[PDB]
Amino acid sequence: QTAVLNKTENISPVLAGGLFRAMLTGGPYPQSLLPAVLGRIRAEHARPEDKSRYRLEVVTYYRAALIKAYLIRNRKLEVPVSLDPARTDRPYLLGRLFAVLEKAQEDAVPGANATIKDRYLASASANPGQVFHMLLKNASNHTAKLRKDPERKSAIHYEIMMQEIIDNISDFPVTMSSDEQGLFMIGYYHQRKALFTKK
Amino acid sequence: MTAIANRYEFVLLFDVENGNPNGDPDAGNMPRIDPETGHGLVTDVCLKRKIRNHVALTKEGAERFNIYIQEKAILNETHERAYTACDLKPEPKKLPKKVEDAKRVTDWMCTNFYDIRTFGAVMTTEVNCGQVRGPVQMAFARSVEPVVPQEVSITRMAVTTKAEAEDNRTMGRKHIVPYGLYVAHGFISAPLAEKTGFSDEDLTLFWDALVNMFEHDRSAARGLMSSRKLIVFKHQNRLGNAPAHKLFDLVKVSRAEGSSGPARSFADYAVTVGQAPEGVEVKEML
Amino acid sequence: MTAIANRYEFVLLFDVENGNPNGDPDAGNMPRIDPETGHGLVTDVCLKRKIRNHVALTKEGAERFNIYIQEKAILNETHERAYTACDLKPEPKKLPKKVEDAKRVTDWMCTNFYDIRTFGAVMTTEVNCGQVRGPVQMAFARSVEPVVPQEVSITRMAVTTKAEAEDNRTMGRKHIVPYGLYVAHGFISAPLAEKTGFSDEDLTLFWDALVNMFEHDRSAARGLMSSRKLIVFKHQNRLGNAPAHKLFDLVKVSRAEGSSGPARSFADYAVTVGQAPEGVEVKEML
Amino acid sequence: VSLDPARTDRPYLLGRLFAVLEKAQEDAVPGANATIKDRYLASASANPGQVFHMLLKNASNHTAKLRKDPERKAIHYEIMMQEIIDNISDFPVTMSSDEQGLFMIGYYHQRKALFTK
Amino acid sequence: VSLDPARTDRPYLLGRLFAVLEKAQEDAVPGANATIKDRYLASASANPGQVFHMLLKNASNHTAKLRKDPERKAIHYEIMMQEIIDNISDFPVTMSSDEQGLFMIGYYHQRKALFTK
């Protein structure tokens, strides 16, 4: 999963040895793992031309599992196995918010080629304070369209989510560290699964 | 409906005396003015309303001369009339999905409403019916020199509502322009008239309405006011032969020689007209 | 079709009276301004729209003078039409894999369309068709003095929709600029013109469109606008002979002598032109 | 974290004020197709000095309807506006990105409070 | 932040003056259907020189009516009006947008004070 292209030829020997050693002995993982996965996450851009009509995900099951394991072992943090609505960590909260924004957009404009995930995933995780205002501003246009629908479809529900999540934040940070970006990714992954999971 | 085949332009002059030509909703009811210079202003919408009223009075609801924007109408119901006429089924917000039906609806609407056929309208609304520009346009009217409105106090014997300070009386106020002279411009275009079917009889009726606009508009708030001059330029081909601003420069109004004090009548001014370029003809209806 | 053989730069002046030159759709409908200094602005896209309209009106679909961006069209259909004209089956996202077929499809498009030949276009959508730059382009226009927009309130008799009190009426509003003067810059490059065939007759037509741009787009909200000056610098070489910014400095505009109140006509300003360097000529076509 | 009535950061206060104005408009004209949030949200956050002088006019225009009915819900808004403006000194001509983020945060904090019991 | 009695910024003073004038009318004619601010708020902020003189003229009637009975503050109101108009040099013919915003800020600061205590 960490190869440049998903092919065994590009696997770094250092990781090959270190992962096996740590697995057998229970020692700390190699320190280069987290940046290695983050690079692959931030570089990939799948497109609809792939055979599967729905576009490919980049935050896959395996990568999330790896990040969780790394954070638990080396950094001594705590991470739930599924969404926890009482976390209150700024990276986690931002990761949660991104998912609802994308969900609203993709409902407002079906079949778009370029979603916010295709244009803002990297910078938003790196420098939250520089991009988030634009995303919030566009969310207004996206939501208002649903409101005027005869059925009103969603509109109230998404705004309720946005209000409740935001209530625990005070300011947008200017910069974040690597582990903070890992928390951001985990938060995004959990929230995404929370949707699509009433029926 | 045949379309005119020439480009027109015109300028109009009218005068007011001891009256309020057009009030301002956001300044009590003072007349509109240019704050930086004190020249008066009149919105073109007022003139359009006056023309609509005169046409309605004169034609008396004859065929193909109905007025779309009436006294207290509801516009969506008016639109629905066109749909039912063409036997179509209205859609909540979209036009008929086939071009032929949409064209039929728009043609029906332009057919029998004079004001739409002349000025155009915005009808997207909810019962969608499209948009129109209209070949006739007008600009704001500006006074030739600064004006100085006055306010007057008045008294009324009776009282309107039950009060316990009583019997009591009440007092109010008005505003008045001692005198003023105004100028307006307008245009007519052939390409749009070709699209809407603006006919020549309509043009004659338009001239008539301009001449006799104010005769039916007497009211307590407006004193005496009337039209004084009307000049028309006609181009020789489907497109212009000269820039517009150069033509408006030909008409010049200046203080009459014998007038020295503040103006108080039309006799205090002098008006002259130059010579139009070779490609344009100038005729004077007033 | 022969391409031009010299580099050009030009300047244009125009003004407006009691109208909204270009309101941008994010502050209600305020005229677009620079927040930090109050100077007005206009987007070049607006001007190019007017040029397109004028050409379409004057040529009436003559051969080699079609316009690519027509009102409410679908571009992919035009791309497919080009593909059929060159007799190729389009791929979902890619140009034909033989160079000659791609050149043919691109050249057909660049040939039968004027605005593509003049301004370039982005056509790399599903029906892939390539890109073009275009030898002509312009910058933003900027006013010479800060503007002071005014707000106006208005009324209407009728109502649009049914409800408890819908007897009723309504109100709206407008914005206008009492007066303003604007400046613009532009460039033309021979090397790019060589890639599309942009010919001299196109250049003459372009000058004609520039001088007569505003003559046709009268509307309720636009007031009265016109052009006043047109200056063109011509180089003697396919590449330049002086920096661009030096030439633009040669033209100065300032307060007219004795004028003290806020500007209200073109007569309130004075314009002068210096002497160009040896390698460049200057003309005043308007 | 929740609405802090003592923060006194100018973008925060502006964000609160915008929300209260929107609430007043919604109360005045039910079911409006278009709302100030759609018309002005983009402009106000970037250049406050250009639009607030306009929003405040419609504010009074709306409150006039309510105060003219037996609907007494209607000096509450005026009281809130007096409290909020009491800390402001001037309107910025332009604001940075992070300031806009803080503006949005303040807006959302304010909005939630209005809908509590 | 609150009302600053020494700002001397002309729009600020104009806002304060408008606030006191409207308070005076309110006291003079209770329950009025159409108040001065409903009639003139836009013009007063946009073009002070157009209307302010006649607004001042009418004020005398309101004060005269009040002080004709055993009720007083009216001397207090006229004292404020005189001390404020002492500092104003001249009524501008027109004002910019930021100046209009400052006008509203001054108006609200002044109005909050009157209801204190």
The DSSP line for chain B is -----S-EEEEEEEEEEEE-SSB-TTSTTPBPB-TTT--BEE-HHHHHHHHHHHHHHHHTT-TT-B-SS-SS-BHHHHHHHHHHHHT----SSSPPSSHHHHHHHHHHHHHHBHHHHHH--B--SSS---B---SEEE--EEESS----EEEEEEESS-SS--S-----EEEEEEEEEEEEEEEEEEE-HHHHHHHT--HHHHHHHHHHHHTSGGG---SS--EEEEEEEEEEEESSSS-SS-HHHHHTT-EEEE-TT--SS--SGGGEEEE-----TTEEEEE--
- Provide the strand spans (E) within chain C: 8-19, 41-42, 136-138, 141-143, 150-156, 170-188, 224-235, 251-255, 269-273, 280-284
Which residues of chain B lie closer than 8 angstroms to C220, CB-CB? Answer: 44, 137
The answer to whether the Cβ–Cβ distance between B26 and E93 falls below 8 Å is no
Q: Which of D33, D37, D41, D43 is best to mutate for the C interface (most C CBs within 10 A)? A: D43
The answer to whether the Cβ–Cβ distance between E93 and B35 falls below 8 Å is yes
The packing angle between helices E10-28 and E97-114, to 10°, is 40
Q: How far is C36 from chain E (nearest CA, A)?
A: 11
Which letter does DSSP use for residue C23 in this model?
Answer: B
The answer to whether the Cβ–Cβ distance between D50 and C28 falls below 8 Å is no
CA distances from D69 to A94, A109, B75, D64, E30 (A): 45, 42, 29, 9, 16
Cα nearest neighbour of E34 on chain B: B28
Which letter does DSSP use for residue E36 in this model?
Answer: H
User: What residue has token string 């929740």?
Assistant: D2
C246 — contact with chain B (CB < 8 Å)?
A: no
Closest Cβ–Cβ partner in E40, E49, E93 for B27: E40
Question: How far apart, in whole angstroms, are the C-alpha atoms of residue E78 and residue E83?
Answer: 9
Which residues of chain D lie closer than 8 angstroms to C30, CB-CB? Answer: 50
Which residues of chain B lie closer than 8 angstroms to C218, CB-CB? Answer: 137, 187, 189
Q: How was this structure determined?
A: cryo-EM
The answer to whether the Cβ–Cβ distance between B189 and C218 falls below 8 Å is yes
D32 — contact with chain C (CB < 8 Å)?
A: no
The answer to whether the Cβ–Cβ distance between D47 and C26 falls below 8 Å is no
Q: How far is C238 from chain B (nearest CA, A)?
A: 35
Residue D64's SS3 state is helix
The answer to whether the Cβ–Cβ distance between E96 and C151 falls below 8 Å is no
Which residues of chain D lie closer than 8 angstroms to C26, CB-CB? Answer: 42-43
User: What residue has token string 């209209």?
Assistant: B134
Rg of chain A over CA atoms, in angstroms?
Answer: 18
Which residues of chain A lie closer than 8 angstroms to D109, CB-CB? Answer: 166-167
D53 — contact with chain C (CB < 8 Å)?
A: no
Q: How far is D33 from chain E (nearest CA, A)?
A: 25
User: What residue has token string 């100046």?
Assistant: E99
Which residues of chain B lie closer than 8 angstroms to C210, CB-CB? Answer: none
User: What residue has token string 């394991």?
Assistant: A69
Listed residue (C90, C185, C77, C189) closest to C133, CA to CA: C189
Which residues of chain C lie closer than 8 angstroms to B126, CB-CB? Answer: 160-161
Strands B269-272 and B252-255, bridge-based pairing: antiparallel
E52 — contact with chain B (CB < 8 Å)?
A: no
Question: How far apart, in whole angstroms, are the C-alpha atoms of residue C266 and residue A60?
Answer: 66
The answer to whether the Cβ–Cβ distance between E94 and C151 falls below 8 Å is no
B45 — contact with chain C (CB < 8 Å)?
A: yes
